[PDB]
Ligand binder design. Structure first.
Ligand SMILES: [Mg+2]
Ligand SMILES: [Zn+2]
Ligand SMILES: [Zn+2]
Ligand SMILES: [Zn+2]
Lengths: 142, 171, 112, 262, 650, 81, 97, 131
DNA sequence: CTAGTTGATCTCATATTTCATTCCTACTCAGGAGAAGGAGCAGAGCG
RNA sequence: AUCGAGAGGA
DNA sequence: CGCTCTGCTCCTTCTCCTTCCTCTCGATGGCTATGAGATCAACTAG
């Protein structure tokens, strides 16, 4: 796609988990600017402290949003999140198709095909099979 | 779903705020306005990626009045649902004809029409959950929903959550 | 040759009464009548039937008879003409409106 | 009817004249770029007169007797006389004037020596004298090197355009051609010494004014020349006239067609 | 509320019938407007622009103040030609392949290749029409220019094409082997025009399609275009539009009747013309054909075109030039005691025209007092506009002595001293004829100008009247003062000669004053000196001393001239002694020669007026005009000058 | 394109008027004032005083016909009017 | 008092763009309209009380703009609509740079 | 009195010069036909001068007519137009007290002062002979 | 929370007996210039 | 209230 | 050199057309039928 900086940037289909990691990063950046002026439970508390201190707490809808996404993130340890990026992107998978795989639970290619109609017609199940158990095992680590 | 995009907002500044503090004043206004926003083309706006590196590119004073106009660009993290996708959601409130589940920044009406035909409303349940089939859905239980298109509203944006499929069931 | 000859013709007209108009104003007029490649009369059937905006063109002598053509040909107006901006009540791009004024923030912060 | 035709012709910041569509009617407004409100009927000395008369008022020779500059004119007298270096400079500038004379007489075939031009030089000269009571009874402290160099230096700073490019710089040379021809006419060394016994303080102050005053006559960008030109023609019109309506309306069938054969 | 922007480009085109159907908020079916006060739901219903005191306007609310109407829909029974496009339609059909959908000629002909290459769409079409129209056949096989033996099977119809002719509101085509052309046939042909053909014809894919040149449905402009009328004692007298359209409903409703009921074909034909005729007149009641729509009163129908064509149309009579406010008109009269940039304004006007001053610390106290004065004392205001827009009126309120102003509030202050205004004498022939003046408020009912400024206005005091306009912002004031102020116009671009000068008595008087023979006593000098506000309190030494201190005229006049002015004009007689006393010559604002006359204070280019502007700027030369006037006039008053019959006798 | 700006550095009367009017408008709107107030309550005269020693924080944008423009800071403008 | 045709021609010559607008807009005919950016036609339904906007036919509820024009101008376009002419008003130029 | 305008003695006005009467007649209609239309002028409940004559009558249809005439005094103010019998036309520039005006030895004081420049450029020699 | 009378609203009937006519003064402006379309002709290629 | 015709001035 | 074809020239149609202000007068804007009977809803009271 195209950004407002004039750079033809591909559609950034940011994964739910990595999107939450970037959200924490941006919240920490806001924290640093304002001064200048991981498991489910641990991440759920950090977001509230970050979100509460970045605003007045009136944006409760986005507060509940972050916990629910935190309640459903699939790759939380940012170091191990870096693993699941290349496993899907390095295979030529569409960024849109990469997003849900890196943000949802799946174990076998057929289930991914069943869950994702787009992959049902053109995906190499062999690549899906190898990745999914690695990600399924990776998902269990969290 | 979630994306990173550079969005541009044309903000106005009243002339009285043209003091030295104007730059951070505009910063604060953009921060308070962008947060928690809705749009059909992109869905919901969550936060601003790269909060620093504020792009002002000079403001233009309207001829009619001294107020200055700033076309502020900014990298932002938003959420955009799509048709036929897989979603894991949570139930906020129960309804006799479905559920009002929350999908991150999205509220999805899980209508009874798209539930499995074996799933039936249970009035006696507290909360009034559906417990006539395997897909037990309640406020305290997790849920997966399928988005069969998005519905835009002036107040907010909602979508359709489906349970009558082999996948995206309860929990 | 016509442009120089024409200007001479107008000069005789003005000089008839003895009044004197600076060469610039006559010079501009004759030129506008010969930029198109011919003695474009300033009447309805000359100048008016140019490629300028219809909104400018309409207001002079034939209003509807042009608007039909503009619609028929899906004509477009760039809204750069002065008359096009008076019709829409916007600051024409002339005089004080031939530019824009922007705030010098870096100077503003420095000024403190 | 005349205002509508020229309704929307304005002078853009590149000094060119365009209508709304961007068609370039005049690359430089009025062929000189000077606003019409800073012009006066000034006399061009270098045109009229007999060949000898022109030479006497302008020719300067430090070697011969016919055009020997009077030593008392400057604080430096015989020192200047006999110097070939300065004599060469006089030979150059004088040649320029002869070229200007033959050039001007070509432009104005009739020989009329008065035309509108920017900056009334004479008033500057006269004003300079009274500014600090120039005493004409004592030798001046100017030098032929000071005079000729000053004239050239002034010319280069009469910037109508700004484009460093070759094409623009060529135009900038054409724009001030006539004015600079006048400038040399009334800033000749002989007259600047004999007719106007100016001092270095006076001469330096004068040029600083010619530079400034000329830049004021520059037509301001954004001007609505088209409307202004049409009105400036419309007003005298309502004060022959069937001829005027016969022109603007081309009206191929004229009233009194006639030739003029020489 | 919603984002604000400024129009940047206007794209024209023809309404698509589908688009008209979509946008319209109600279908119109009944030619009746009402019963007693209720309106027919199928005409002028609340779903269009609501009438006053009705906050519906198709659930728009906002009454009728800030919400326009919304267009309607009438589905014509049969297609009808659009009047303005009859000519073009004739031109278009002459080129099409006449029930084939293709162009009579193709790029295989070299001539078309030239025409198809024209950038300008309009000219492109004209050349095509000139050439295609001659093509009387749409044969299928067309010999190829590259290979004469080879033919291009282009024309689907392959038959001939008749010679179309214009006949009122219908077209007749003579077949080369003759009948009236049906409107529907044209739609069928146009529907078969390929997109490629459009562009070759100059049309547009999404903004102007040929089939849209035929009317199958008509939008109904909302009430605001045809406002409700109550010009009598509760009588309607509705605009021509409302009555004119109702006829179409009657004609349209009738048309649908004959076809449905028995279909008396012959009868339908004539009624079709009536439907077409009413549309044509409604679209334009001025055509080459004789038929002229007439109102029941007999007055010709004021068609939509008549609302635009010519002056008094919406274009020239309402947009190019319009009525305005904050302006006053009255008669003028000279006043030498008033500078150039000034003008006298009757208190009875300055008590009416107002300026919206903003409340700020710099002027809160001043504005506070004006409110206390009220709208009847001249130095007062007429309203206080709060932040919410509550235009408190002091005329019908005692709150003037009670209100505490708040920063950011606007005050409708009266016109006060030095408030710029804009004069304009009709006809505003040229630029000078409109200029900006400072304000002085005078206690009489007529405008006061300085004398010299009459020439640029071409004005006179024989009963001429002028118009005054008032800026309404702190900005537009700046634009006037720094661009249209009188001093900045002293030098006229018309001829490079100053447009102003000394005229009338002050010119005749000054000449007498500066003679070589005029000598002025001490006493009459002191008064003259005090009349020059530039005077520095220093009395010049009299030219004659011993027998009696006796100033010459040129001495006194020269006190008004600024220092540092050096003028030198020589005539044939001027020889540094000027025995004739002609010529002119000044030094540091001290006259030495000449009789000051037209050629030194008139409109001449070299005159004194012109010189001063450049040496001290317009703001200084302006003060010169008054000072000379205040001197000569005071002197002439005490020396007098008249004419008489004996002067004319030789 | 701040490099090689081809427009003259002299501040045209038109923009003189526009800047003065604009700044007077802001001053009337109780905007910050960058010079001492000497009792001169007129917003417009305050604006002229500000322009006297180059305190106006505005930059002009001169549009060439092509569409490109130049950003001239009023500080570098040579006010000679 | 009428601000005739020749009377604006003086203002244009003076280069007083800002003043010319004030005479033509603030003195008389000031009017705010709403426009669909999909189709530049005055068809928006401005439910100001509800803060809702829509363009039936475009079904657009996110692209709306406030535009100031003389009431005569609004009246002009409407008649142009009456004769099928669609004066689409767009707030963005096709050619950017 | 620079242009065609003129100066007029203020006292000469105070003694009645060019004082004029201004009679304005208003007409009012009772109502329209009797077909369910009624209206009257009996002081229904909720220019400058004095009424001169109130005329009450009925047209041939018997409809009550009311005609009102209000008179007012017109006194020459500044700018009120005047003209000689020779086409010399001008307004009152300003008015002076009697003493302020120039006076011959015999105590005569002008009522009206005009400008010499009016004469030569208009070729109105007849106006001089009449005077 | 129903039932009472009385206002509101819908529908149609008798329908008379019923409109096309009186033309008319009257006559000159004011013509000029430019587009558009046909008609005939003359010459160039063709048979 | 609107059209039309008229009577003028600047 | 006639035939034919085409464009060229000529010769009649066939159109369209003008700064601001003030008052008074006056015509005019227009045609459409009767309420009665009956049933339902609206208001009030017990
Ligand atoms: Mg007059
Ligand atoms: Zn509405
Ligand atoms: Zn066909
Ligand atoms: Zn739309």
């Amino acid at each position: 796609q195209i950004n407002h900086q004039g750079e033809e940037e591909e559609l950034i289909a940011l994964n739910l988990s990595e999107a939450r990691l970037v959200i924490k990063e941006a919240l920490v950046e806001r924290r640093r600017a304002f001064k200048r002026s991981e498991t489910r439970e641990k991440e759920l508390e950090s977001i509230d402290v970050l979100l509460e201190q970045t605003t007045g707490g009136n944006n409760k809808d986005l507060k509940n949003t972050m916990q629910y996404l935190t309640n459903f993130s699939r790759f939380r340890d940012q170091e191990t999140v870096g693993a699941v990026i290349q496993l899907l992107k390095s295979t030529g998978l569409h960024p849109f198709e990469v997003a849900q795989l890196g943000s949802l639970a799946c174990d076998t290619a057929d289930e991914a095909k069943t869950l994702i109609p787009s992959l049902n017609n053109k995906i190499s199940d062999d690549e899906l099979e190898r990745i999914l158990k690695e990600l399924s095992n990776l998902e269990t680590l969290y | 779903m979630f994306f990173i995009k550079d969005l541009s907002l044309n903000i106005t500044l009243h002339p009285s705020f043209f003091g030295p503090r104007m730059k951070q004043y505009l910063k604060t206004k953009l921060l308070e306005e962008v947060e928690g926003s809705c749009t059909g083309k992109f869905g919901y706006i969550l936060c601003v990626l790269d909060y620093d590196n504020i792009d002002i590119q000079r403001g233009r004073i309207l001829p009619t009045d001294g107020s200055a106009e700033f076309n502020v660009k900014y990298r932002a993290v938003v959420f955009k649902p799509f048709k036929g996708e897989v979603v894991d959601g949570t139930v906020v409130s129960c309804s006799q004809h479905g559920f009002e589940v929350q999908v991150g920044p999205m509220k999805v009406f899980v209508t009874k029409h798209l539930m499995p035909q074996d799933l039936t409303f249970n009035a006696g349940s507290n909360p009034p959950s559906y417990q006539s089939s395997e897909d037990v859905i309640t406020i305290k239980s997790r849920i997966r929903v399928k988005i069969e298109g998005c519905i835009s509203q002036v107040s907010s944006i909602h979508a359709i959550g489906s349970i009558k499929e082999d996948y995206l069931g309860a929990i | 040759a016509g442009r120089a000859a024409l200007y001479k013709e107008v000069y005789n007209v003005i000089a008839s009464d003895g009044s004197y108009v600076n060469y610039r104003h006559m010079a501009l007029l004759v030129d506008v009548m010969t930029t198109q490649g011919g003695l474009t009369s300033v009447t309805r059937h000359g100048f008016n039937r140019s490629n300028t905006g219809a909104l400018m063109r309409c207001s002079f002598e034939e209003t509807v008879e042009i608007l039909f053509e503009a619609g028929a040909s899906a004509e477009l107006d760039d809204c750069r003409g002065v008359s096009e901006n008076v019709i829409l009540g916007q600051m024409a791009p002339i005089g004080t409106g031939a530019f824009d004024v922007m705030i010098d923030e870096e100077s503003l912060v420095k000024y403190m | 009817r005349l205002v509508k035709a020229l309704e929307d012709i304005m002078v853009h910041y590149d000094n060119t004249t365009r209508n709304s569509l961007g068609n370039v009617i005049q690359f430089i407004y009025g062929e000189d770029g000077m606003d019409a409100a800073h012009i006066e009927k000034q006399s061009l000395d270098t045109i009229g007169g007999s060949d000898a008369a022109f030479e006497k008022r302008y020719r300067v020779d430090l070697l011969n007797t016919d055009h020997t500059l009077d030593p008392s004119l400057l604080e430096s007298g015989s020192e200047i006389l006999g110097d070939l270096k300065l004599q060469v400079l006089l030979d150059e500038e004088y040649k320029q004037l002869v070229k200007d004379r033959k050039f001007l007489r070509e432009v104005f075939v009739d020989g009329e020596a008065n035309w509108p031009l920017p900056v009334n030089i004479r008033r500057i000269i006269q004003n300079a004298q009274q500014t600090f009571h120039i005493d004409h009874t004592k030798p001046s402290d100017l030098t032929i090197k000071d005079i000729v160099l000053g004239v050239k230096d002034l010319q280069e700073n009469l910037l109508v355009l700004r484009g460093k490019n070759e094409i623009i710089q060529n135009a900038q040379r054409d724009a001030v051609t006539l004015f600079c021809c006048l400038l040399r006419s009334r800033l000749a060394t002989r007259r600047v010494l004999q007719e106007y016994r100016l001092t270095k303080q006076a001469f330096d102050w004068v040029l600083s004014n010619i530079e400034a005053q000329f830049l004021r006559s520059v037509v301001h960008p954004g001007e609505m020349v088209g409307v202004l030109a049409a009105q400036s023609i419309g007003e005298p019109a309502t004060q022959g006239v069937p001829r005027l309506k016969e022109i603007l309306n081309v009206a191929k069938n004229m009233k009194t067609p006639s030739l003029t054969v020489y | 509320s919603a984002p604000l922007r400024t129009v940047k480009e206007v794209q024209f085109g023809l309404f698509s019938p589908e688009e008209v159907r979509a946008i319209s908020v109600a279908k119109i079916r009944f030619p009746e407007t009402m019963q007693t006060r209720a309106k027919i739901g199928g005409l002028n219903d609340p779903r269009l622009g609501s009438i006053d005191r009705n906050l519906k306007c198709q659930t728009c609310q906002e009454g009728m103040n800030e919400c326009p109407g919304h267009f309607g829909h009438i589905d014509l029974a049969k297609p009808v030609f659009h009047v303005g496009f009859i000519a073009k339609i004739k031109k278009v059909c002459e080129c099409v392949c006449m029930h084939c959908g293709k162009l009579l000629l193709d790029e295989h002909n070299e001539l078309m290749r030239q025409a198809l290459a024209i950038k300008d769409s309009k000219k492109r079409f004209a050349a095509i029409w000139t050439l295609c129209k001659t093509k009387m056949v749409c044969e299928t096989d067309v010999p190829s220019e590259d290979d004469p033996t080879q033919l291009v099977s282009r024309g689907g119809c392959g038959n001939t094409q008749p010679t179309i002719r214009k006949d009122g509101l219908k077209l007749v085509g003579s077949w080369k082997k003759l009948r009236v052309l049906s409107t529907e046939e044209i739609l069928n042909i146009f529907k078969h025009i390929s997109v490629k053909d459009f562009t070759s014809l100059g049309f547009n894919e999404v903004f102007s399609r040929p089939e849209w040149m035929i009317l199958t449905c008509l939008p109904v402009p909302p009430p605001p275009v045809r406002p409700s009328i109550s010009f009598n004692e509760s009588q309607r007298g509705e605009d021509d539009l409302t009555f004119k359209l109702a006829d179409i409903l009657k004609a349209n409703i009738s048309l649908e009747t004959l076809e449905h009921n028995g279909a008396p074909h012959h009868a339908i034909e004539e009624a079709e013309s009536l439907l077409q005729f009413h549309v044509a007149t409604y679209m334009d009641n001025d055509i080459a054909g004789q038929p002229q729509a007439l109102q029941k009163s007999g007055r010709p129908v004021k068609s939509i075109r008549a609302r635009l064509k010519g002056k008094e149309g919406r274009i020239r009579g309402n947009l190019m030039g319009k009525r305005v406010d904050f302006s006053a008109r009255t008669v003028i009269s000279g006043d030498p005691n008033l500078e150039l940039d000034q003008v006298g304004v009757p208190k009875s006007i300055a008590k009416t025209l107002t300026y919206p001053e903003v409340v700020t610390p710099y002027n809160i106290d001043r504005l506070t007092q004006l409110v206390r004065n009220g709208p009847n004392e001249h130095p007062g205001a007429k309203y206080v506009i709060r932040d919410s827009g509550d235009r408190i009126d002091l005329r019908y309120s005692k709150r003037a002595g009670d209100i505490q102003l708040q920063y950011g509030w606007k005050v409708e202050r009266h016109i006060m001293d030095n408030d710029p205004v804009l004069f304009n004498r009709q006809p505003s022939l040229h630029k000078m004829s409109m200029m900006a003046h400072r304000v002085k408020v005078i206690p009489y009912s007529t405008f006061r100008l300085n004398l010299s400024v009459t020439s640029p206005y071409n004005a006179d005091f024989d009963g001429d009247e002028m118009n005054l306009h008032v800026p309404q912002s702190e900005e537009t004031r700046a634009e006037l003062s720094q661009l249209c102020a009188v001093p900045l116009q002293i030098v006229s671009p018309q001829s490079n000669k100053p447009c102003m000068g000394i005229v009338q008595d002050t010119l005749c008087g000054i000449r007498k004053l500066t003679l070589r023979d005029t000598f002025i006593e001490l006493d009459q000098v002191l008064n003259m000196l005090y009349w020059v506000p530039d005077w520095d309190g220093v009395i010049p030494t009299p030219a004659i001393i011993k027998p009696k201190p006796l100033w010459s005229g040129k001495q006194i006049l020269s006190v008004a001239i600024p220092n540092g002015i050096h003028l030198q004009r020589f005539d044939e007689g001027t020889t540094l002694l000027s025995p004739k006393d002609n010529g002119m010559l000044i030094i540091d604002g001290q006259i030495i020669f000449g009789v000051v006359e037209k050629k030194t204070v008139g409109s001449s280019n070299g005159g004194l007026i012109h010189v001063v502007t450049r040496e001290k700027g317009p703001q200084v030369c302006a003060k010169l005009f008054g000072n000379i006037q205040k001197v000569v006039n005071f002197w002439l008053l005490h020396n007098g000058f008249s004419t008489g019959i004996g002067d004319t006798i030789a | 394109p701040k490099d090689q700006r081809a427009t003259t550095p002299y501040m045209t009367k038109y923009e003189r008027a526009r800047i003065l009017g604009t700044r007077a408008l802001q001053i009337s709107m109780n905007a910050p004032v960058f010079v001492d107030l000497e009792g001169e309550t007129d917003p417009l005269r305050i604006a002229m005083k500000e322009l006297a020693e180059k305190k106006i924080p505005l930059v002009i944008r001169r549009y060439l016909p092509d569409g490109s423009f130049e950003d001239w800071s009023v500080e570098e403008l040579i006010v000679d009017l | 008092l009428r601000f005739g045709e020749m009377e604006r021609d003086c203002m244009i010559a003076h280069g007083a763009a800002s003043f010319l607008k004030e005479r033509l807009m603030e003195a008389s005919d000031a009017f705010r309209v709403h426009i669909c950016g999909i189709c530049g036609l005055m068809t928006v339904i401005a439910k100001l009380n509800h803060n809702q906007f829509e363009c039936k036919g475009c079904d657009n509820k996110i692209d709306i703009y406030q535009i100031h024009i003389p009431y005569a101008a609004k009246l002009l376009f409407q008649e142009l609509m009456a004769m099928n002419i669609t004066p689409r008003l767009y707030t963005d130029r096709s050619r950017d740079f | 009195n620079q242009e065609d305008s003129m100066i007029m003695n203020q006292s000469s006005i105070d003694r009645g010069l060019f004082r004029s009467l201004f009679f304005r007649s208003y007409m009012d209609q009772e109502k329209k036909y009797g077909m369910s239309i009624t209206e009257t002028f009996e002081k229904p409940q909720r220019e400058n001068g004095i009424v001169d004559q109130v005329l009450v009558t009925t047209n041939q249809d018997g409809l009550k007519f009311v005609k009102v005439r209000v008179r007012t005094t017109k006194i020459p103010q500044i700018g009120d137009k005047f003209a000689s019998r020779h086409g010399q036309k001008g307004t009152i520039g300003i008015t002076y007290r009697r003493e302020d005006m120039p006076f011959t030895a015999e105590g005569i004081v002008p009522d009206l002062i005009i400008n010499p420049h009016a004469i030569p450029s208009r070729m109105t020699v007849a106006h001089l002979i009449e005077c």
